[PDB]
Amino acid sequence: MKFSNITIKNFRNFEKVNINLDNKNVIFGMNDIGKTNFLYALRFLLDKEIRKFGFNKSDYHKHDTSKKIEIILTLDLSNYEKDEDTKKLISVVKGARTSANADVFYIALESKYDDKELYGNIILKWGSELDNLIDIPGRGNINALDNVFKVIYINPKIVIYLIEEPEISLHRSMQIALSKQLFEQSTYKYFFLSTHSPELLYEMDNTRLIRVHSTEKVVCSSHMYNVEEAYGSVKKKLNKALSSALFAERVLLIEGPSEKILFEKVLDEVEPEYELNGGFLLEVGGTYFNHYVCTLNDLGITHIIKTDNDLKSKKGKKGVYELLGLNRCLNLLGRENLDEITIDIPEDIKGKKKKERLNERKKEIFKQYKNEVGEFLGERIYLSEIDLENDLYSAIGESMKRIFENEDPVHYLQKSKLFNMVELVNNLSTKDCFDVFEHEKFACLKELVGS
Amino acid sequence: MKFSNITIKNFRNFEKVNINLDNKNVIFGMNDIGKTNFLYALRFLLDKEIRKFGFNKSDYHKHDTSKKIEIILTLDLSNYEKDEDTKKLISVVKGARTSANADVFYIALESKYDDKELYGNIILKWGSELDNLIDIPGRGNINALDNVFKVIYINPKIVIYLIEEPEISLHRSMQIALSKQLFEQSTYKYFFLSTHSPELLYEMDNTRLIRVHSTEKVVCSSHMYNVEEAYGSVKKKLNKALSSALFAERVLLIEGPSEKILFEKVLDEVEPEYELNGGFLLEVGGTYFNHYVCTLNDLGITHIIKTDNDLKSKKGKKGVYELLGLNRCLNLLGRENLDEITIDIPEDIKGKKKKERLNERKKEIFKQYKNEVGEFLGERIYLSEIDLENDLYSAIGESMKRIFENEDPVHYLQKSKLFNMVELVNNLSTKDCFDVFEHEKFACLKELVGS
Amino acid sequence: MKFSNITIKNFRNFEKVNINLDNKNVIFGMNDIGKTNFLYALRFLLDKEIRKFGFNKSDYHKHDTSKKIEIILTLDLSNYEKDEDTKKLISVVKGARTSANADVFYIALESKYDDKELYGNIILKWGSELDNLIDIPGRGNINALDNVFKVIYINPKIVIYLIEEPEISLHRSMQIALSKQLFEQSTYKYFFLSTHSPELLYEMDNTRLIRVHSTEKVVCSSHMYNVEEAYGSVKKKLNKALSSALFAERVLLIEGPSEKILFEKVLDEVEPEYELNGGFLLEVGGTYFNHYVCTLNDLGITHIIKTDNDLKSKKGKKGVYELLGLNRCLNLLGRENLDEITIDIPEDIKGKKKKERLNERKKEIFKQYKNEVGEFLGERIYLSEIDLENDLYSAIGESMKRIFENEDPVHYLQKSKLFNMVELVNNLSTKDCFDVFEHEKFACLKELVGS
Amino acid sequence: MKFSNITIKNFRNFEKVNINLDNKNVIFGMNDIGKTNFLYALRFLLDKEIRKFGFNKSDYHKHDTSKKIEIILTLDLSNYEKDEDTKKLISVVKGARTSANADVFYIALESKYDDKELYGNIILKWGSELDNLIDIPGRGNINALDNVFKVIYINPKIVIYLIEEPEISLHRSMQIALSKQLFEQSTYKYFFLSTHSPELLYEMDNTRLIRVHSTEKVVCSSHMYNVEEAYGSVKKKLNKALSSALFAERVLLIEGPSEKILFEKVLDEVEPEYELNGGFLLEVGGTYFNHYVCTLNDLGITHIIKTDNDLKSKKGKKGVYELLGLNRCLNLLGRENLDEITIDIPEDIKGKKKKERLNERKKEIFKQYKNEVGEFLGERIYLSEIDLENDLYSAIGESMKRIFENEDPVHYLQKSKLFNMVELVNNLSTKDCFDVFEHEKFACLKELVGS
Ligand SMILES: Nc1ncnc2c1ncn2[C@@H]1O[C@H](COP(=O)(O)OP(=O)(O)OP(=O)(O)O)[C@@H](O)[C@H]1O
């Protein structure tokens, strides 16, 4: 038994929607009314204390048009025989399971009209297929569906928890403790969680993320969120960055903290309320992009990636290099991992001429894959020429020549990135940040704003 | 007129306390009862709708011992004559201002005993000095103190706002918008703010931070928080880091993101609930430490600093270097900025021998200031020998020799810090993180835990 | 269709009780808890909004012993075919009416145990006989019993009203208007009424009076109250006297207002709180007793009758007399109406000798029916010798000789009854009222007190 | 000290009213809003918990016109020195009692305007005369008027009780017990009582009755109600009749129960809702009228008196008679008690000729005081010719000739009044009751209806 999907046709803010499910579902978003009414739809399906009051006039979509409320839940009941819950649901049914090789089982809610006696009359049915459903046999005030499930609702037998906004009047470390108790522990096998706090998602795994969109009409995006085997050692700082990234609409994926220093200076000199409108700067370091990108893509969040063209030397060999910054974007568009590039380099002068011939080989590599770079730029993936300091030299290079007394300011900024980045931020004006922001190689910051 | 201090002697959780004030006071902490009763003490001093009900038996410290409730507020009323509020308070008083060259004015609340008629009888007095106070003359239900001030209390004439927990059922960007409206705008000249969210302090300036301690007895620490003129370009990312650091008890100050990757791997292999007990990793990059350290020191938060011995070359000259990592700790202990150190370096071999002779000069500089290093280590300031990769080589250097096929793993890790740090984290065990954590040059992580 | 009886076995204050019913039932008494729980038992039988909440632990008689709640209602459904409600109940049933010549139909409530899941599970059944009942077929939240009846509950489809205490914050004439609207008008065919006010029963006819007794255990007495054809001209002053008599426990039935003056003087000189303990003086004038006596007997109220031996002359004949005061008590014990007694009286002296020979003939009639008088006295019926002034002469006759200056005070008191009764009350002492109250011919006043 | 009057000028339903007071004040009527706002005016004068909230906009008479609320209470403080409350009020005042021979002391409430700050600011003053009042000196939240009095408000130090509607959900004998505890016992020296039940006034003495009239404008009538020394033996049945008479508007004062039988038959054959509109039949027997008439006159209730011309023989003498029915109406208009009338009567025929010559002497007495009878009829006092049976003979005498087979039906009805009155009621039609009601000697029943 594993919760597959719930079909909410007619309810307070729903028309013909499907939400895919698994166990441990998490709903979040900016529409508070849809996050309330999703848990109210689950309480009308599976709790006696909400279903015994019936339907009012307020819980209809249009009050005279499409007057048939249906909630259908999908269970997928064929599983291995050592599971207790599969036997506990198949023992209660008698003729609702018709053929023993069937796989899918439905719990179908139906309602009648409201125009006479001002009442809903919720009617619940069982069966293995959608046509020829059979009524659930009850005798008094207790249905036979109520002898299977149990619902506990938390606000500040197969057991389904419903936790609504647990961060209210709560400290930060208690929210991280509640996140660790929710996902790592096996106390809560089935829940549905609504939250506004990113500290309640610092340890999340094997879960559905449900994002409710910011529109007035309810749009639901669902993702089967997992952390893979190679990502398990950098897992919780990835979850700490991504849990703050889940409450945004437009997210820029950067690498360094000095990039955050420079871009945040350019942002509060140009667009000083980017954090109010839904912008977020996400630091991604030392990993590939596609675990972030599949999560934000299936949750409907626009992902913008700014990256540099890096050359990585491998272990045990000298003079052979890997095309790392190409291969991350090739993994993002689903293509295969590229081959080895070897460069024959002498001893030469090691301080600057080796860096200059590596920059010239990166310039030739950026030249001969120009249509692939445009393909990446076609989306929100932006690959730099050599680095971002050399893209910064093409915009404010006279300013970098007049702040520092050195002749070459790019090498002086690359000698110590953080302290000379703070010295570049401190002697900077408004027109320099507009020269950075208006440039064609820093277009992605405009894609962070979008207005 | 400027709010100096409030003396709460007898109230629900107070004995003889003083809290220093300014305008725009912010109270935070883990004692919710003291943060409620501070605003209740201000409502009993300055609001009619709480003062007209009197005192019960529950708002006494001991119910039979020390039965004299006093709230005394300090105003410091001498100011320039173009201020409207100084004239609006000095026009109402007639004989309470005795001598015209006086500076300090008091608003003194007093209460009587509770053992007969079960009532408090709050009595309010004026005067320029603490002895020979005069009664405030009123006529009916309205006091003459009520013709000066006005109190608006917000829960989800000189005007004093009182905002209690505004982040409840609220989105993140609305909390950042409320922070920008609270501190940058001049709509709220006087307030007292209680919060649990770090996003309500992302733009804070010219304010009192009040930290209520985690003990059962109420301890109040207050700091006159300001951002100086040289720190104004890196101001709001400093406030974003420090606002999450204000809700912790033990804070480690680090520099890089790769240090956060390595230390966070060592932390969830050794002490996996450090974030639950009050630990926090704070990234400080490119700035001096003392603006963080004066704020956390006057708020009573233990600050732990891990830093490396850096040599910084200056602009316009070659072969002369600055002792930057010494001078940050010398600024932390209040000593003067050190002189210039020049090193005569030939052309040599630029790739490794220049780095080796710079490491040997840093080793000699760490040798000849050994008593200063112990002095720093005497507190929570920890200065590394060359870097933290060389301190990591002394603990897990056989592991770094067996992961990478290179002969020297320190130079390979310093070639690309982030990606080889993720490769060092991925091939790492429990005993390697215990070898890092048990070492004498990584003692500060134990100071992050303290248990 | 006509409501016959309700059998409440297990409920909050009931063990195996039966209450006989008709349409327009009225419940009254001093047990407020039983008058609340009777209407709660009807709401649990016939209202959806009480039956959907189920049973708690508090609505059981003993919480572990006799755990089977049964409410059975009797309908007697065979009637003439022009009644709409008989066809509206027989159209809904299909197989619950088995044989077409059956007369009695039952609505049977049943409940299960409470020791597991803390719930009652009310189960409702139909059928023509008590064994082999069939379940009421429903489909959702709406039963098929709910498609017949409708319950409106009033507190300050076949339609059943439930009015609980309508005299609260209400004027007296509005209570008399509500009584006239309740019983004379045909707006309320079916109701159940609880009241504390006697002005809500000033016009009552064709109704059940239900008296709940003053004990802690619930005792229900029911009477089919009607006013007959010969009593219809003196009907509403009889209802005004009897409606105040229904809220008492011990009621003395007297005739004159001068008897009320004398007995009320004797009562506040002997037992000054007789009205507090449940005593009531009821004036019955010009009628027979048995309409009062059948109502108070079937409602369980002890009726005490004090009466005089009267001789009534008939119309159109002279010298023949009727034994009226004997025949009222003979009608009370169910015996036949006695014959005519003729007395041959000359012209004589008309003022006193005719009254003396009529008193001697009444003394001979009281002599020769002595065993019948004892039979009446055996109950609470007390027949005087001649009048009550002559019984008053045997107790306080020296006091009546010393107040009035006339030789014969009985004839002077019978000349003007009211004004000389006020003159006898005004010159009276405590020992004279104890001489009246301790006498053997005024024992019935002691039967008014009983303690 | 004795409460004299309260002057409520501006309040919710008051303009310039005076209500005279004593101790033990009782307010009753049909305006529930005025009975609520009288106790709210006393709570605003004398209770801290209502006065500390101030005045809203709703408790003004006109919201912009006559914006000065004044409540002035009169105390009359000069009394004998053994009274404790006089010394307890004169000890608290210091200069408010100016001259020691003064008698009257005032408690003056004043209020300010409401158009700025939305507040009332109740100001209380003391002094011996109405001009040159002095402020009551207080120090904090407690006034010095609050150190004298104490107010307890009951809803289902000098101590003032306020009991509002205590008959709600209460039995009848508990209301009579509460009446006996209120007036006979000295537990409640000062109260103000509002009620709707006549059983809470069955033992009332030494009290103010306040009747609030049925109009929308508040009219207050007050009477100093007492029972005199000669009326003390018939006191509580007089209070039982008069307490039901206090809740009516038009009251007919009759004598016998047979008059109630006949008039109540004529009333439900002509005006069947006389009890709904405010009519009441009051039985007065054996007493004079003026104790009822002074109470109903000072309470503003229209009193209608129907009486017969009676001749009363005195004690110890024969042949001399008293003009009783004249002298009750002469006491009602305040004239002196008339002399003795002697009639020389022989032995004659005692049965009918003595009654005929007494009726002829009553006819001559009704002839020679014709202008006095018209004077009585000028008001609502109606004196019959001989009796009311002889006035009934002039209207329905052919009906009385056709019901009874006797030749003279007046003597047959006067032989037994009650049983032949029930026989006259039983054989009666609608046109006979219209012949009674339309007659000029039964005009007072029309004065009972008035429409
Ligand atoms: N002044 C310079 N002129 C030319 N090349 C330089 C200069 N400084 C540094 N480089 C280049 O930078 C490379 C790396 O620098 P190096 O290993 O000497 O460390 P560093 O930055 O001088 O040391 P530290 O970080 O301790 O200040 C050198 O191999 C050399 O090619």
Ligand SMILES: Nc1ncnc2c1ncn2[C@@H]1O[C@H](COP(=O)(O)OP(=O)(O)OP(=O)(O)O)[C@@H](O)[C@H]1O
């Ligand atoms: N294989 C090596 N052997 C010895 N020294 C090396 C080696 N690789 C790098 N270095 C040292 O590191 C210094 C800085 O490296 P360099 O400027 O050549 O960039 P890089 O790390 O090779 O380039 P990129 O970042 O594009 O991969 C050199 O001046 C040299 O002293």
Ligand SMILES: Nc1ncnc2c1ncn2[C@@H]1O[C@H](COP(=O)(O)OP(=O)(O)OP(=O)(O)O)[C@@H](O)[C@H]1O
């Ligand atoms: N003084 C008396 N002595 C003897 N018998 C009397 C006396 N007074 C009245 N009676 C008797 O009472 C009977 C009825 O009284 P009657 O008809 O004379 O009226 P009343 O009571 O005198 O009149 P009223 O009611 O007008 O005062 C008489 O027939 C007579 O037998």
Ligand SMILES: Nc1ncnc2c1ncn2[C@@H]1O[C@H](COP(=O)(O)OP(=O)(O)OP(=O)(O)O)[C@@H](O)[C@H]1O
């Ligand atoms: N049939 C009659 N004819 C004439 N006068 C009568 C008649 N009956 C009664 N009376 C008058 O009524 C007066 C009072 O009546 P009386 O004393 O005889 O009592 P009663 O009414 O006959 O007795 P009881 O009340 O026991 O029936 C008599 O004195 C007489 O004058």
